[PDB]
Subunit: 249 residues, 4 copies
Amino acid sequence: EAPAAVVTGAAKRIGRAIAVKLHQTGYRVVIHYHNSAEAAVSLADELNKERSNTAVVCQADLTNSNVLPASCEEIINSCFRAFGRCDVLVNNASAFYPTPLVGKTVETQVAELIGTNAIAPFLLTMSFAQRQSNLSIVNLCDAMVDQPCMAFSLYNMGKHALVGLTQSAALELAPYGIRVNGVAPGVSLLPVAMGEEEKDKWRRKVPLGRREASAEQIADAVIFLVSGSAQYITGSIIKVDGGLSLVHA
Amino acid sequence: EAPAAVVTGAAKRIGRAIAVKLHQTGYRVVIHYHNSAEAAVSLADELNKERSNTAVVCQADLTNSNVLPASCEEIINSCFRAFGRCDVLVNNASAFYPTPLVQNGKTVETQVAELIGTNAIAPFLLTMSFAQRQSNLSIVNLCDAMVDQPCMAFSLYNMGKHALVGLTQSAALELAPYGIRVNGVAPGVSLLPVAMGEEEKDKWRRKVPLGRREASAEQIADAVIFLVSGSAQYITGSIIKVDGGLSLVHA
Amino acid sequence: EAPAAVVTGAAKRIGRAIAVKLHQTGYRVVIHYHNSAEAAVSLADELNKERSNTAVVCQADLTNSNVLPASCEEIINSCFRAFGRCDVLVNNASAFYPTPLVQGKTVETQVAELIGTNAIAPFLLTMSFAQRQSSNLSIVNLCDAMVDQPCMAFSLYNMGKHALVGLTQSAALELAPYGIRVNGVAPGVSLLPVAMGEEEKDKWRRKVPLGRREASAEQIADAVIFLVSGSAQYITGSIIKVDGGLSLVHA
Amino acid sequence: EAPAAVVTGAAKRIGRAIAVKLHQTGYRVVIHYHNSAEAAVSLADELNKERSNTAVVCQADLTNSNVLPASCEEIINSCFRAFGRCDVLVNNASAFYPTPLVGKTVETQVAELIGTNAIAPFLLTMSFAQRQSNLSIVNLCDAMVDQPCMAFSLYNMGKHALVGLTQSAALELAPYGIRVNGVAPGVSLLPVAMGEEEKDKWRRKVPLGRREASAEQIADAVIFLVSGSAQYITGSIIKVDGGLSLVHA
Ligand SMILES: NC(=O)c1ccc[n+]([C@@H]2O[C@H](COP(=O)([O-])OP(=O)(O)OC[C@H]3O[C@@H](n4cnc5c(N)ncnc54)[C@H](OP(=O)(O)O)[C@@H]3O)[C@@H](O)[C@H]2O)c1
Ligand SMILES: NC(=O)c1ccc[n+]([C@@H]2O[C@H](COP(=O)([O-])OP(=O)(O)OC[C@H]3O[C@@H](n4cnc5c(N)ncnc54)[C@H](OP(=O)(O)O)[C@@H]3O)[C@@H](O)[C@H]2O)c1
Ligand SMILES: NC(=O)c1ccc[n+]([C@@H]2O[C@H](COP(=O)([O-])OP(=O)(O)OC[C@H]3O[C@@H](n4cnc5c(N)ncnc54)[C@H](OP(=O)(O)O)[C@@H]3O)[C@@H](O)[C@H]2O)c1
Ligand SMILES: NC(=O)c1ccc[n+]([C@@H]2O[C@H](COP(=O)([O-])OP(=O)(O)OC[C@H]3O[C@@H](n4cnc5c(N)ncnc54)[C@H](OP(=O)(O)O)[C@@H]3O)[C@@H](O)[C@H]2O)c1
Ligand SMILES: Nc1nc(NC2CCCCC2)c2c(-c3ccccc3)c(-c3ccccc3)[nH]c2n1
Ligand SMILES: Nc1nc(NC2CCCCC2)c2c(-c3ccccc3)c(-c3ccccc3)[nH]c2n1
Ligand SMILES: Nc1nc(NC2CCCCC2)c2c(-c3ccccc3)c(-c3ccccc3)[nH]c2n1
Ligand SMILES: Nc1nc(NC2CCCCC2)c2c(-c3ccccc3)c(-c3ccccc3)[nH]c2n1
């Protein structure tokens, strides 16, 4: 019988490439999404057209709140409801915007940035583990985590927390046979609306090819980590950054 | 006059030693506390008996909530209110307890709010309030030397301390053009609870390469004192381990 | 036409597992060895029975000396001689033994072997690899997951492996414009000597979170195979731990 | 009795500042030098002017070779012979120049860069320990070790090995009460031997003050680490970089 995976933030971009590859490898998938309702439903349709009832959608805000634990438990439950099992979790959804130290309130920025990047991953991990052979979790981290963007303290705090979770949960879930790893993009899939000039400014920095990663290149590292070729790999974060994190100021 | 420091969770243990040492160095201090009211007031008295009008207490819960930013703003306000200035922030207060992934009384939302609020979000908000109000200005965050070899079942605590490393770096970078340095001190195992079982105390002490003992609270304070001093004026975004080699020891 | 790979120290154990997996993936292989002549020739024998004229052995000492650069150049030259090309270099050969700081081999010999095999030879093979150049060119270095929790009295071994991390990063950066990717694989504990004590092996096995066992040679090789493959086209300067969580475990 | 310190490469620049500051703190010093004979002697003269019989010189090449262990043993010996004890070792001497992967022979470059930055520190550490209060060793590391300068492979390899030594020796010498730590400068003391497009270029990247560190600021960290205020600190590397290592490309 086919394994099943939850991908958070799977409607668009990297999340979508990850769900597509997982599906192409034989997985059934829960396409989680927040606002991108048309993209998610149409993705699930494209995949079900390929193989009947191998995709379902699941909408949820992953901002930190009193209701997040229940929401995360329901995302995991949706995988069991659809597919009767949950073998892989990909924590991909992420809020990303600056939060300078000097019209959202700060407590909302905290809830979105720390919720999506760290707290929701933790809660989903808890539910994933509680509801349980090649089980694993892949967390989407950030290659530049130690050379942070200016004014992005909460985002960066969130991504650091996520490293912490990857390690802590690898240690704690190893006895249940659940591996926990990360993939750390550098710059990938620059926004379509971003001017090519500014796109080129990031591209120029990348040693390998002076270009951004494709979403599929990030997905490839995920597929490796969930494969049986990574059976002894846990607590590892693989950078897929074309050398960007190695470049000094 | 004399510079002023805020020390969070300053009523007892390591925070208290840092307050004591900053006060001996010539600082006026805000002793923040949450539950340890007696110990706090008793410390303020002792420090004011030593030099009058040089310590105050400030009570606040540093659990995450929608009012945490106001509470952090009021802490930095209480320093200006009492001393006219705020030169040093020490982010020391911290909740620490297990939060297993596979199953007190506490709800997980409470665990999240306490562990992530005290270790990460309040430091961030206090750092904002500190910078917004603004010499040798700096912030010191109490990190954890064991943050990449975490205690079993301490996920949220570890996520917190990892976040605090990220804040230390992000705020060092962002606040440098305001001449505010941001650094960390990372203890290994330090000041074991007097009430902890002797067998367990020994098990911790035996692990430490340098002297087979825990750090004193004073030893931790010494590194804080260095980082706020004029001998550390080019130092920002650095985290100094004060761990006797503990983090170096393999399984 | 099949790509070609050089594997250092490939007569046995992890190096052999890597050579075999590359060969099955379609590569022609140079099996480098130092003392294990019989094991190397035998491996090349097998692989040639599988596909003729797809393996050769190459003998070299990788101890540091004034001729080491020529020896490394001759290793790379030996791939071009046998196969007309050299696509992949795996730096796997390694001396490993204690070198205590306080007290047959002279310390000069210790430095030469430990720093030579683990770091300088990899640097010189990388130079010759780049100099002697469709393509998916890369280098994989066999690193060590426990590099920051070192074994007692293994200073020179640990310095070597740390230098290898530096090389991995430095070469990733510098050879990126040439299309040459440079990455690492960092085993924890893998392949215990058949005649290590039943107690000593079990002591190592029990430390490992994931399965309480050492990695197989195949498992290390799997990670090498990924990094050389087109599934890793954007990955350079990455070191993948393959350690079953061992590096995360505090003492 | 006054404690004694060996400082390698102490005739000029950061090494000289460390010797001065240690001497100012009450140490007797051995001033090691390789080529800067006039400056070394001038410094010893100046410190002995302050306090008689508190400074001596020792000459040695720290390039790797068959004679380097004996050379390192004699450096430590010069401290015992002059002063009757050796409480502090500062490994500061360092060769630094580009060694492109694609003049000196390569093997000479290896000997120099790996010898000064790693192997001499290791041998000096063995000699120091073998001859044994507040004993410690401070290794001058590099804050930019993970974002290395282009074409500086051997130098970066040497500095990485030095981190390794720092950690390994911290662990192994802890039972003898010998602490082992590091100080990692970012940019410090730009030569007048440097264009000012180039100097300005480096200065402009430093978040804290848009300037290099003074040699004295580097020395301040060494002083702290050797002091009684760092009694529990071992295996720690303190960056003194004005935040340079945190600045992304
Ligand atoms: N792109 C890069 O260069 C880069 C660099 C470093 C790290 N990464 C990491 O890689 C992952 C993929 O990157 P990306 O650029 O593809 O991500 P992205 O497009 O910024 O975000 C992915 C998705 O996250 C979901 N999301 C955002 N806020 C949410 C909320 N409050 N609740 C629930 N879901 C929410 C969104 O869903 P809806 O659209 O459905 O609302 C969004 O489509 C992220 O974890 C990112 O941080 C990416
Ligand atoms: N001790 C160690 O071995 C060790 C090891 C690694 C890291 N560290 C770090 O070093 C710092 C000091 O350690 P420690 O053992 O002295 O700390 P601790 O005794 O565990 O905590 C210090 C204080 O934090 C305050 N605090 C806790 N929860 C709070 C809340 N919700 N709101 C406001 N304040 C709260 C408490 O104040 P009241 O008592 O006033 O309620 C407590 O006295 C901590 O950041 C810790 O994480 C310590
Ligand atoms: N096994 C583990 O648990 C583990 C852990 C961490 C890292 N690693 C790394 O993984 C790699 C493979 O491990 P392993 O256990 O398979 O290694 P190994 O058995 O210790 O060594 C592999 C080969 O290195 C070659 N070698 C040794 N000294 C040499 C010299 N002076 N010149 C040339 N070649 C020399 C030897 O070749 P001959 O037999 O031909 O003389 C030896 O067979 C190493 O780089 C190791 O450091 C392994
Ligand atoms: N300056 C910076 O921005 C910076 C940045 C990162 C790290 N650091 C580190 O901090 C330390 C001090 O930096 P610096 O700029 O003061 O260093 P430096 O001037 O480049 O070198 C210090 C001394 O090293 C000695 N030396 C070089 N090659 C030697 C050899 N083969 N044998 C013996 N001694 C040799 C020289 O002594 P003679 O003059 O007597 O020949 C030289 O004066 C070094 O370890 C350096 O790598 C500095
Ligand atoms: N969730 C999330 N989304 C991101 N970008 C998305 C792009 C689609 C619109 C929502 C924001 C990034 C970017 C990004 C990605 C591209 C360019 C610059 C930064 C980065 C990113 C890139 C370089 C250095 C540090 C962070 N992280 C990220 N995380
Ligand atoms: N806020 C906080 N408090 C701590 N301890 C306090 C002790 C008094 C009651 C509140 C909890 C620790 C400890 C601790 C400190 C001593 C022993 C073991 C772990 C550690 C700690 C020690 C070794 C390895 C990892 C963490 N962190 C910590 N953070
Ligand atoms: N080149 C090389 N060879 C190794 N092992 C070989 C075994 C065959 C005879 C030469 C030495 C190791 C080991 C080893 C591997 C297994 C057990 C303990 C350490 C380790 C190793 C294992 C755990 C923690 C730190 C180092 N590295 C290594 N590097
Ligand atoms: N032994 C030594 N010497 C150095 N500089 C000295 C300068 C006097 C002539 C001998 C070489 C550096 C420099 C240096 C120092 C200043 C500017 C740029 C790099 C650096 C350095 C600076 C930035 C990033 C990485 C390294 N390391 C170093 N190590």
